[PDB]
Amino acid sequence: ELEAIAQKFEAIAKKFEAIAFKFEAIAQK
Amino acid sequence: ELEAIAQKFEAIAKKFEAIAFKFEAIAQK
Amino acid sequence: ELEAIAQKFEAIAKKFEAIAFKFEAIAQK
Amino acid sequence: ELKAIAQEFKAIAKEFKAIAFEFKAIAQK
Amino acid sequence: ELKAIAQEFKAIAKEFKAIAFEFKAIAQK
Amino acid sequence: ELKAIAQEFKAIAKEFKAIAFEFKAIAQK
Numbered sequence: 821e822l823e824a825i826a827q828k829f830e831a832i833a834k835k836f837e838a839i840a841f842k843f844e845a846i847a848q849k
Numbered sequence: 850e851l852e853a854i855a856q857k858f859e860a861i862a863k864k865f866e867a868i869a870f871k872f873e874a875i876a877q878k
Numbered sequence: 879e880l881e882a883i884a885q886k887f888e889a890i891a892k893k894f895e896a897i898a899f900k901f902e903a904i905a906q907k
Numbered sequence: 908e909l910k911a912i913a914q915e916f917k918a919i920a921k922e923f924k925a926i927a928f929e930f931k932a933i934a935q936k
Numbered sequence: 937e938l939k940a941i942a943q944e945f946k947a948i949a950k951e952f953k954a955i956a957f958e959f960k961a962i963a964q965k
Numbered sequence: 966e967l968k969a970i971a972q973e974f975k976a977i978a979k980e981f982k983a984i985a986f987e988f989k990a991i992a993q994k
Contacts, residue, residue: 821929822992826985828929832922833978833985839915840974842908847967850958851934855927857958861951862920862927868944869916871937876909879987880963884956886987890980891949891956897973898945900966905938 821933822988825926825929826988826992828922828926829981829985829988832919833981835915835919835922836974836978836981839912840971840978842912842915843967843971843974846908847971850962851930854955854958855930855934857951857955858923858927858930861948862923864944864948864951865916865920865923868941869913869920871941871944872909872913872916875937876913879991880959883984883987884959884963886980886984887952887956887959890977891952893973893977893980894945894949894952897970898942898949900970900973901938901942901945904966905942
């Protein structure tokens with residue numbers, strides 16, 4: 821379960837990075 | 850503690866869903 | 879590891895609060 | 908971009924629910 | 937919507953602090 | 966503000982990766 825919890829936290833990390841790039845795109849205009 | 854940690858992660862999930870719907874509302878305009 | 883996990887969750891909490899204040903600034907206009 | 912950000916937050920919410928599930932399984936030993 | 941999104945992130949930050957608290961309690965056995 | 970929000974989400978993503986790392990270390994006993 822602990823390894824599955826780590827895997828999903830890394831997937832969550834990737835998604836927040838994806839969100840970041842979206843905000844950069846809006847900031848660009 | 851583990852059950853309390855799961856409960857709060859589910860509450861966090863609900864809040865991110867609430868945020869999502871807000872962004873959809875801004876996207877609608 | 880558990881204390882390090884708590885520390886980082888508190889650091890994450892601070893960052894979401896920082897994000898919040900940024901959205902308030904955009905909302906102000 | 909805004910709608911895409913909304914979709915990511917929904918997917919983030921789902922990862923946290925799955926995380927909560929794992930912690931529950933750990934609560935059952 | 938923007939201010940409401942800010943409020944949710946604040947509430948999210950608080951859930952993570954409470955999560956950190958639980959992990960600390962687990963660190964004390 | 967938008968770019969700054971993007972930066973915070975990137976830093977948030979990194980905290981979650983470090984959290985995942987800690988859980989992995991707990992998986993090794």
